[PDB]
Amino acid sequence: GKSHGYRSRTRYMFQRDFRKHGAVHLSTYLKVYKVGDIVDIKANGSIQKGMPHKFYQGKTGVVYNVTKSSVGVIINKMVGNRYLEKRLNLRVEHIKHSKCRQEFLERVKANAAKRAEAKAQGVAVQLKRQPAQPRESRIVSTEGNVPQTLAPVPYETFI
Amino acid sequence: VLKKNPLKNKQVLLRLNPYAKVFAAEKLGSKKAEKTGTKPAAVFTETLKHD
Amino acid sequence: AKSKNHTAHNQTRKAHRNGIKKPKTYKYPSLKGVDPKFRRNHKHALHGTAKALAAAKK
Amino acid sequence: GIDHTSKQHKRSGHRTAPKSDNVYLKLLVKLYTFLARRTDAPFNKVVLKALFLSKINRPPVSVSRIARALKQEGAANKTVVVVGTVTDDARIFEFPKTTVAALRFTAGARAKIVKAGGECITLDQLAVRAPKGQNTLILRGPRNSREAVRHFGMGPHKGKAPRILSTGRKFERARGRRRSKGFKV
Amino acid sequence: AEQVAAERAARKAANKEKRAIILERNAAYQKEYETAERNIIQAKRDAKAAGSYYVEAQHKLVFVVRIKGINKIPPKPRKVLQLLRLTRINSGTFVKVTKATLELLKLIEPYVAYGYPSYSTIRQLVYKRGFGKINKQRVPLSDNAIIEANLGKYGILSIDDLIHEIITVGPHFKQANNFLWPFKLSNPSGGWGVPRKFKHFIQGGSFGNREEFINKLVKSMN
Amino acid sequence: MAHFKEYQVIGRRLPTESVPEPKLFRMRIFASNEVIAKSRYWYFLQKLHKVKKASGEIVSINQINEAHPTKVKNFGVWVRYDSRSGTHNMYKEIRDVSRVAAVETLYQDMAARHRARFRSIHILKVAEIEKTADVKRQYVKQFLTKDLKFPLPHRVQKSTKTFSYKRPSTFY
RNA sequence: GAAAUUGUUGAAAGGGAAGGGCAUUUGAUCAGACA
RNA sequence: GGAAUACUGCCAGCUGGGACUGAGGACUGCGACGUAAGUCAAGGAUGCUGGCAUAAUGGUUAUAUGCCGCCCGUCUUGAAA
RNA sequence: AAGCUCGUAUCAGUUUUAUGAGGUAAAGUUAAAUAUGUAAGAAGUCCUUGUUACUUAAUUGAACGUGGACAUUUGAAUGAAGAGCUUUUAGUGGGCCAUUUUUGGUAAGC
RNA sequence: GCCCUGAAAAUGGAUGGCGCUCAAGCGUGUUACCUAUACUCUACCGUCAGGGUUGAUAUGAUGCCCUGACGAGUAGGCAGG
Structure with missing residues (x-):
């Protein structure tokens, strides 16, 4: 018959990353998670206690709860036509930070600098990010570089 | 009550664009171009006539 | 007299009619699940800081 | 054909005008459709749409709640407005002077307000006294204190008090309401 | 009462200034366009006389037209077309070209035909087919008060200023391009060319990027 | 494809700090217009070098007229x-x-x-x-x-009108 | 003293059904209007 | 050493013929043209002429002609069946 | 269907930038394309000095606060017949086809 | 590449029919032209949304007007007659 288990069909999913087997390195446990941090869930197949279901692999959530060995995680899960807000209990082997907030705070501070700097510079800030523009004009110099005429090439077997 | 197109019906074209009068009176649609002497250098022409 | 048992066809299309509504998440979320030991102290932290101004505010 | 991001010919879901056939009601709806249009102050625009409210959406504002809003700082000189019916609360043994303007007063709240040297008003006289709404307080009565709203959204673990005829033992306290018989909820 | 008489030639004087300022301000936009089209000509000439080449600045604006009917569209493009405001066959608006908007067009290419409009077509469309969006209500322009009461906060106090903000792709292009109701065009006057529209313009159909060949297709549709 | 024209196309490999000033390749393309010409150019540079329309450029597009038409x-x-x-x-x-x-x-x-x-x-x-x-x-x-001379084999009469009173003749 | 249904007279129609829609010609009829 | 045509594109270039529509109904506005008074093609049609006062136009109904038109209600994924 | 509180506004069958997860195709452990999670600010940032019975070797942390400061290029594109909220009830719960993939089957209007 | 052969099924017989051979066949290219209830402009009906208008001395305040956008539909629901 059919089988739907708790860890069912996770064969390749919890595997241990070839030549990364063995004991977990110890900066995993030196990392301090706080309420309001955003973290990414990648399971660690060697640590069974505190291990999230195969739905939460790769999902990203916020820390509402900090406890002895574990942290709280709020996920938004699609069921039916709506999103439910899930709370999860996971040990810090299965968590790590997501760098989008580190990079976001780096740009927040730079934006603070530029503005307050530009506050004595008479505005004209241009503090947004703008997409890659169409490339402006230019003049190539053929001097030293001569256009090399190319043409299609005949067919051959070469077997 | 009814939309009078410019580009025909000159009177509506002149409430919009008060510059439509001094445009035509001076032409500027047929305005002539200054004459230039420059020729393509012998490298450009060598490329264009090439095999 | 067998039937047609399972299909997912039309289900994603019915899903977007009213279309995947959001958490409607709030300031001050619920403290369900928060550490009871932290939560006990947090009672008295707020309990004290309210009266903190009751000495100043009068 | 056109590709619509919305549903066509779709009404706004509001009261454009009361459902009541009351005649004197429509004279205020007539008076505040005029002021809402030409008086540029939002007070008139608030009182208008409050004349269209149904009964369930018009809970009564007791004469006690009126006394809180006066204890509210700076408001002791304001003229409280209630679109709805004012009712009596004797659980308060003192009442201020002030003024009240409402559609309907109960005979008890008329005495109590008149008893203190205050005054009962209608809405029409308020429009004449303060067309813009100068120095007024609108007050709404509690909507979710109804007996039916207590039942809204019944379902597991929501604590919504099932709709039921008879309250007591032996009526739906047993299987599913306690751990000992079956489960709980 | 003073009223009629004393507030007429007082008001009628301000009317004189709006179009006396539109007078000088349009003169400057005509000398601006022509010397830009001239310098692009002189630059290709000064380069070929140096033995070198001159690459044009890329086109910062396109005009998209919806070539396909309203049904049997996959969900992902059907969402894009609705974000460009292409709600029917033959309609279209100006689209600013950045890396953001340019990977949208790659989704909808089977469903649209777009290119690079000249100042010619930008001027015909706006005069002939140009409408405003005022409290919704899709108003015809026909006057300078319709533009000044809406966009006047930005400048853009005439219909000559729209066409300028549109073709220069100035800072306010988003406000101005959303102040224009999507252009409702007609079918092409002389036909589409080709037997079949829904091949790509490079294989002999009507869709895709036809570049400066869009100027000719739109005029038959205007 | 059409009533053809003949173009030359030139473009180089968008400049990077590592390899600036690329080699400006050139081809002669038979196509009706410039749009079909350019898009037929990148078709023959993807068989030659490391380029594509996003990774490359078109510097020049010029039409080659026959010299002795x-x-x-x-x-x-x-x-x-x-x-x-x-x-x-x-x-x-x-x-x-x-x-x-x-x-x-x-x-x-x-x-x-x-x-x-x-x-x-x-x-x-x-x-x-x-x-x-x-x-x-x-x-x-x-x-x-x-000094070659030949006739027009079986003169071919295009019929303009519905009826004719003669019978025609294929003499030339 | 209705309808199915029928007899008589009058009118029109008819090449393996009949009946319908759009359009106008032809035949019979109809006001309104003007003045 | 000169040109001219071709091709492409533009003009707030000029002029002619055809078809369709005439909504609204005191003035208001924006313009244009005039020193001026005023006029104008500028927030939707007016002027002139003629005929019949007729069943001419129009309606109504039978016929004829051109093209089209499967039998209704129901169950059904699917009925002219 | 009945509405309700509101109205510049949080959103979105979409891209972009940033950043995770994957182990199918090809390759012969590696690893696409398309789809997929999160973030792009005011529920923000920096400072200043309060609370607690939790935490610390500790005036040290955590969580929440007082006072002060930075507003619309306020933190990417485009769009938005407005955003949210609730009550109440009908029908339905035999589906079928085409495309791009695919198992059983020799194949099939299976 | 085209054609022929391989190539045999039962009432009479179907590139849709006639018929077509420097085609009215096949491969390809440039143009002209035909026409859907789709597109553009106009009038009118209704639906929705946004606004204008309560002063005697008339006849409608479920009224009058302004402006826009929109119109398929079984089971089903609602509003108005």
Whole structure:
């Protein structure tokens, strides 16, 4: 018959990353998670206690709860036509930070600098990010570089 | 009550664009171009006539 | 007299009619699940800081 | 054909005008459709749409709640407005002077307000006294204190008090309401 | 009462200034366009006389037209077309070209035909087919008060200023391009060319990027 | 594909700090307009170097006019076309007035005899034969004999009108 | 004293059904209007 | 050493013929043209002429002609069946 | 269907930038394309000095606060017949086809 | 590449029919033209949304007007007659 288990069909999913087997390195446990941090869930197949279901692999959530060995995680899960807000209990082997907030705070501070700097510079800030523009004009110099005429090439077997 | 197109019906074209009068009176649609002497250098022409 | 048992066809299309509504998440979320030991102290932290101004505010 | 991001010919879901056939009601709806249009102050625009409210959406504002809003700082000189019916609360043994303007007063709240040297008003006289709404307080009565709203959204673990005829033992306290018989909820 | 008489030639004087300022301000936009089209000509000439080449600045604006009917569209493009405001066959608006908007067009290419409009077509469309969006209500322009009461906060106090903000792709292009109701065009006057529209313009159909060949297709549709 | 023109296209590999000033490749493309020309250029640089439309540029697009548009010429043409069951090489000699007018005549011959679409045909080389007797094909050598004279076989009368009272005659 | 249904007279129609829609010609009828 | 045509594109270039529509109903506005008074093609049609006062136009109904038109209700994924 | 509180506004069958997860195709452990999670600010940032019975070797942390400061290029594109909220009830719960993939089957209007 | 052969099924017989051979066949190219209830402009009906208008001395405040956008539909629901 059919089988739907708790860890069912996770064969390749919890595997241990070839030549990364063995004991977990110890900066995993030196990392301090706080309420309001955003973290990414990648399971660690060697640590069974505190291990999230195969739905939460790769999902990203916020820390509402900090406890002895574990942290709280709020996920938004699609069921039916709506999103439910899930709370999860996971040990810090299965968590790590997501760098989008580190990079976001780096740009927040730079934006603070530029503005307050530009506050004595008479505005004209241009503090947004703008997409890659169409490339402006230019003049190539053929001097030293001569256009090399190319043409299609005949067919051959070469077997 | 009814939309009078410019580009025909000159009177509506002149409430919009008060510059439509001094445009035509001076032409500027047929305005002539200054004459230039420059020729393509012998490298450009060598490329264009090439095999 | 067998039937047609399972299909997912039309289900994603019915899903977007009213279309995947959001958490409607709030300031001050619920403290369900928060550490009871932290939560006990947090009672008295707020309990004290309210009266903190009751000495100043009068 | 056109590709619509919305549903066509779709009404706004509001009261454009009361459902009541009351005649004197429509004279205020007539008076505040005029002021809402030409008086540029939002007070008139608030009182208008409050004349269209149904009964369930018009809970009564007791004469006690009126006394809180006066204890509210700076408001002791304001003229409280209630679109709805004012009712009596004797659980308060003192009442201020002030003024009240409402559609309907109960005979008890008329005495109590008149008893203190205050005054009962209608809405029409308020429009004449303060067309813009100068120095007024609108007050709404509690909507979710109804007996039916207590039942809204019944379902597991929501604590919504099932709709039921008879309250007591032996009526739906047993299987599913306690751990000992079956489960709980 | 003073009223009629004393507030007429007082008001009628301000009317004189709006179009006396539109007078000088349009003169400057005509000398601006022509010397830009001239310098692009002189630059290709000064380069070929140096033995070198001159690459044009890329086109910062396109005009998209919806070539396909309203049904049997996959969900992902059907969402894009609705974000460009292409709600029917033959309609279209100006689209600013950045890396953001340019990977949208790659989704909808089977469903649209777009290119690079000249100042010619930008001027015909706006005069002939140009409408405003005022409290919704899709108003015809026909006057300078319709533009000044809406966009006047930005400048853009005439219909000559729209066409300028549109073709220069100035800072306010988003406000101005959303102040224009999507252009409702007609079918092409002389036909589409080709037997079949829904091949790509490079294989002999009507869709895709036809570049400066869009100027000719739109005029038959205007 | 159309009534053709002949273009040259030039472009280089968007400059990076590692390899600035790339090598400005050039080709001669037979296509109706510039749009189909450029898009047919990147088709033949993806078979040659590391380029594509996003990773590359078009520096110049110019139209090549025939230099002596009025002089009859002899063109041999080498063609790479993809048949149904494979691909092949061919040499066809075209006697025509100009370069681009010879091309237009080659597709029509490839289409008619070999059923090969414009998409199935790569034009390897088109070059003028200077001296006669270098013309290898017999149907072109047909027209090169001294002071040649032939009739118009079976004069073909286009009928303009519905009825005619004569009977016609095919004399010429 | 209705309808199915029928007899008589009058009118029109008819090449393996009949009946319908759009359009106008032809035949019979109809006001309104003007003045 | 000169040109001219071709091709492409533009003009707030000029002029002619055809078809369709005439909504609204005191003035208001924006313009244009005039020193001025005023006029104008500028927030939707007016002027002039003629005929019949008729069943002419129009309606109504039978016929004829051109093209089209399967039998209704129901169950059904699917009925002219 | 009945509405309700509101109205510049949080959103979105979409892209972009940033950043995770994957182990199918090809390759012969590696690893696409398309789809997929999160973030792009005011529920923000920096400072200043309050609370607690939790935490610390500790005036040290955590969580929440007082006072002060930075407003619309306020933190990417485009769009938005407005955003949210609730009550109440009908029908339905035999589906079928085409495309791009695919198992059983020799194949099939299976 | 085209054609022929391989190539045999039962009432009479179907590139849709006639018929077509420097085609009215096949491969390809440039143009002209035909016409859907779709597109553009106009009038009118209704639906929705946004606004204008309560002063005697008339006849409608479920009224009058302004402006825009929109119109398929079974089971089903609602509003108005």
